[PDB]
Design a protein around this ligand. Structure first.
Ligand SMILES: [Zn+2]
Lengths: 184, 49, 98, 109, 100, 212, 170
């Protein structure tokens, strides 16, 4: 009975909430694959750009508010790092909390956002040496793709996660192992 | 399926093409097998002309 | 060091050597009792993953997150068997299960 | 080589209207009497998880028993309903037995 | 009748509470993979039952192809009502909802 | 061998301040950082045995605490020198709280408590009492890597959450009131906490739980 | 088995029941907190009647206050967490019923019963001193009708609590 609702919160059929964000990033697994492959997406950009087609979507979406808060977060993110999780100050919440990723372009898992920048920085050479596709032009794409890879409200993951565990179980110190452990 | 509602889904939701990927690991479940692999080798091989 | 059995408090006097903050267990309910639901939950995903890890299989954490978050929904550690299913609201599910 | 048993002619069937088991008003095993195909939970579960949900549900319902029925919107029951035995000049109609009274009682007050 | 006139007034008030205004509508501008299906499905049924058809058929004997054909033009006259878990819902015109 | 007892006490005694700080009251960072010797210097006489009583203290909310939790009042921390927890010892401490009018007391027993005194724990609402084992506190649990950060929320914040997700309070994932973390935070029922989960898939990921 | 054959109530005292009567009532409206805050109430029958009154009015105040805002439907608000707490009290409440050894109202003694999986309930006779105390304070299969007669009397008195016990909703 698990239901993601259009709020993206996981809810058991009665409405009882389970998770607020599916993966916590609410990223659809079947669409998650090439997301972290930036170098591939860097190539073919002119193709993907035609597939996602950012043009039409500017109207219906808030591009900015997420991006502001994001950059607002990442600054202070790198600020307090080395301190442990408990001493770490909670001042702002992660991006996806205050911002629906579907309505808001740029609202993105802090993880992906980091991989993107880390990539986009160290590989920023390629943006110059190549045709010159602008980082922003590319950044704006991945964020769009990221937002387009979101889970769909009203699927069945409860079944998925069941089958997702169920099927591979059929595939197969001295601690307890295998299905017996899993059963356990 | 006996009605357009049903077959609407069977076309647009549960599908071969619509499902190219595990929900589990997100990995391709579909692709040519056996012969077709061994063929591609002898085809894509340089000795092919 | 690998510990057979579980007593955390025992280890807590031992931190002169070991790092107590890195202590992890193979027993959920123990952790739930000691470090509470969240750590217990985090332990679950870790433990389950070890299974599929050993068999080289691959399961996206999102599933394991869903399950772990589910078994902890009551803040206790609930089975998927008849017992945990008791608290459910819908009868027919329960009624048609066992 | 060895030709086996298990020739396909022995194994297949389609579209079982006939049997409609009396209790459930549902088909029955194919075999050679004209049954059908069992679905089942693991197959049910897929539909839910598979994605073909409207389709899935519809299929299940229609291949397992669908009619429609009278229910008392008052007594809230399927069973207590029945047809009326009408008069000449009057059409029969459905009424709920539980919420119906002996006519004797009305003229009493 | 007053008891009926009562929960009719009660019908509104709750169903007033459960409606989300246009500006207030918070969900995705996209059409979910599912919403696309059932739209095509429902529209197909109606097209099959001699509902009015806004776009030329051009030789389509398949109502579902027809439904697809309208959807390209957003000529489909439907409205999706998205239920939040509480029961309060939204209402999205088809055409205002971004396809794929 | 007082040494461990001293160490363990000091060690646990540290966790307490850590909690009270974390629970939002005002404690200087160095007061948390008290070394074993100064602890012995301060809290041990010339014995080898520290004095629980000189250890017990009052704590007060910070501004942000008060500003965010106006209902938060003063805290009293208490240790029990006797291993046994006397109903009168309870009665002593209990009335001691009400007399001095603390929002909340905290009473750290050594080993065991008279269950009769347990009945007297809910003695004086609204003021509440919290009881911890000295040995239970040897190691702050929140510091463990599995334990994510926990944040108790203002009633205002709780509203904003529910009104955001349109929930009844009970539809949240529950956290048992007997959960050590709840115990560690001293959660009332019907309180909702923010939990920052560090995903391996995503990054930091916020979640919520309601105390029952 | 928990019935008073003389005080015609549950052998557990009315007051310690009256709290469950209030608590399970709260949970039909799904108030989990207040159930606990109910137990806060305390400062002779006049005392109890005051207490029983104060609990009841406390309940009435809360649920009204609970319904004052949208925290509960008049139909009652019932979720799994709520559904848990019900199964907790109900299970526990039964224990305190089975523990009581004397009707706390009359002080009398009902004899033990012994049942069969084949549904034969054997009444086992009273203990001596009880009959003594009985007249001081004053292995047989039993007829279902008699039993039926027993509980009918019980429920006429015990309706107020069981009305809540058997309904997860108002
Ligand atoms: Zn009727």
């Amino acid at each position: 009975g698990v239901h993601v609702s259009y709020d993206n919160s996981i809810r058991d059929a009665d409405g009882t909430l389970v998770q607020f964000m599916y993966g916590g990033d609410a990223i659809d697994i079947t669409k998650e694959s090439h997301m972290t492959q930036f170098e591939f997406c860097l190539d073919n950009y002119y193709a993907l750009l035609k597939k996602y087609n950012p043009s039409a979507l500017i109207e219906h979406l808030d591009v900015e508010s997420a991006l502001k808060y994001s950059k607002k977060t990442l600054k202070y993110r790198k600020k307090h790092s080395k301190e442990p999780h408990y001493k770490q100050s909670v001042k702002y919440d992660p991006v996806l909390a205050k911002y629906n990723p579907a309505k808001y372009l740029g609202s993105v898992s802090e993880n992906f956002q980091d991989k993107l920048e880390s990539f986009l920085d160290k590989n920023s050479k390629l943006f110059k040496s190549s045709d010159g596709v602008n980082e922003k032009k590319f950044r704006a794409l991945m964020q769009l793709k990221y937002m387009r890879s979101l889970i769909n409200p009203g699927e069945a993951v409860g079944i998925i996660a069941s089958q997702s565990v169920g099927e591979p179980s059929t595939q197969m110190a001295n601690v307890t192992l295998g299905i017996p452990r899993l059963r356990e | 399926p006996q009605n357009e509602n049903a077959r609407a889904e069977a076309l647009n939701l549960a599908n071969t093409d619509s499902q190219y990927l595990t929900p589990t690991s997100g990995s391709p479940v579909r692709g040519l097998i056996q012969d077709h692999i061994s063929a591609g080798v002898w085809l894509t091989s340089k000795d092919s002309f | 060091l690998v510990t057979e059995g579980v007593n955390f408090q025992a280890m807590w006097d031992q931190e002169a050597f070991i790092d107590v903050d890195g202590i992890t267990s193979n027993d959920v309910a123990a952790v739930l009792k000691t470090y509470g639901v969240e750590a217990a939950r985090n332990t679950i995903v870790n433990e389950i993953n070890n299974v599929f890890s050993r068999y080289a299989i691959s399961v996206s954490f999102r599933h394991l997150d869903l399950i772990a978050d589910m078994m902890t929904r009551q803040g206790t550690y609930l089975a998927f068997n008849r017992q945990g299913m008791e608290t459910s609201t819908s009868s027919f599910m329960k009624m048609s299960y066992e | 080589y060895q030709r086996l048993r298990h020739m396909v002619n022995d194994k297949f069937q389609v579209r079982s209207t006939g049997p409609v088991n009396s209790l459930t008003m549902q088909p029955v095993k194919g075999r050679k009497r004209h049954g059908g195909i069992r679905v089942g939970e693991m197959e049910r579960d897929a539909l839910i998880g598979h994605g073909t949900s409207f389709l899935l549900q519809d299929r299940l319902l229609n291949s397992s028993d669908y009619t429609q029925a009278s229910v008392c919107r008052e007594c809230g029951s399927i069973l207590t309903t029945q047809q009326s035995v009408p008069r000449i000049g009057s059409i029969s109609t459905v009424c709920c037995r539980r919420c119906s009274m002996r006519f004797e009682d009305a003229k009493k007050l | 009748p007053e008891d009926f006139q009562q929960h009719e007034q009660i019908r509104r008030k709750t169903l007033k509470e459960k409606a989300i205004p246009k500006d207030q509508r918070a969900t995705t501008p996209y059409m979910t993979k599912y919403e696309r299906a059932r739209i095509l499905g429902t529209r197909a049924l109606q097209i099959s039952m001699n509902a009015p058809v806004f776009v030329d058929l051009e030789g389509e004997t398949d109502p579902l192809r027809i439904a697809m054909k309208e959807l390209a033009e957003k000529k489909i006259p439907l409205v999706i009502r998205r239920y939040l878990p509480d029961g309060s819902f939204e209402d999205w015109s088809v055409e205002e909802l971004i396809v794929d | 061998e007082n040494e461990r007892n001293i160490s363990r006490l000091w060690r646990a005694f540290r966790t307490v301040k850590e909690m009270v700080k974390d629970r939002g009251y005002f404690i200087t960072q160095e007061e948390v950082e008290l070394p074993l010797e100064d602890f012995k210097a301060k809290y041990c006489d010339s014995m080898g045995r520290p004095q629980r009583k000189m250890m017990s203290f009052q704590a007060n909310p910070t501004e942000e605490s008060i500003s965010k939790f106006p209902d938060m009042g003063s805290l009293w921390v208490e240790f029990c020198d006797e291993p046994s927890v006397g109903v009168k010892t309870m009665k002593t401490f209990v009335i001691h709280i009400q007399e001095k009018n603390f929002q909340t007391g905290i009473f750290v027993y050594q080993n065991n408590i008279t269950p009769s005194a347990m009945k007297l724990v809910p003695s004086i609402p609204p003021a509440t009492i919290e009881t911890f084992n000295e040995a239970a506190l040897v190691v702050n649990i929140t510091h463990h890597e599995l334990v994510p950060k926990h944040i108790r929320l203002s009633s205002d914040e709780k509203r904003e959450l529910l009104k955001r997700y349109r929930l009844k309070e009970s539809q949240l994932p529950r956290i048992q009131r007997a959960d050590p973390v709840a115990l560690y935070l001293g959660l009332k029922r019907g309180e909702v906490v923010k939990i920052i989960r560090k995903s391996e898939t995503s990054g930091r990921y916020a979640s919520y739980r309601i105390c029952m | 088995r928990a019935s008073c054959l003389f005080c015609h109530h549950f052998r557990l005292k009315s007051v310690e029941v009256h709290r469950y009567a209030c608590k399970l009532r709260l949970l039909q409206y799904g108030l989990i907190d207040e159930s606990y805050k109910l137990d806060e109430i305390t400062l002779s029958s006049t005392l109890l009647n005051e207490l029983k009154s104060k609990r009841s009015e406390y309940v009435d105040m809360a649920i009204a206050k609970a319904l004052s805002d949208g925290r509960t439907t008049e139909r009652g608000s019932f979720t799994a967490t709520v559904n848990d707490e019900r199964k907790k009290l109900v299970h526990e409440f039964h224990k305190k019923l089975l523990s009581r050894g004397k009707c706390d109202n009359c002080g009398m003694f009902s004899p033990k019963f012994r049942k069969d999986g084949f549904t034969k309930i054997f009444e086992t006779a009273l203990n001596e001193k009880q009959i003594t105390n009985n007249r001081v304070k004053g292995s047989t299969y039993i007829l279902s009708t008699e039993v039926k007669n027993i509980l009918d009397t019980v429920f006429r008195k015990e309706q107020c609590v069981l009305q809540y016990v058997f309904h997860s909703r108002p």
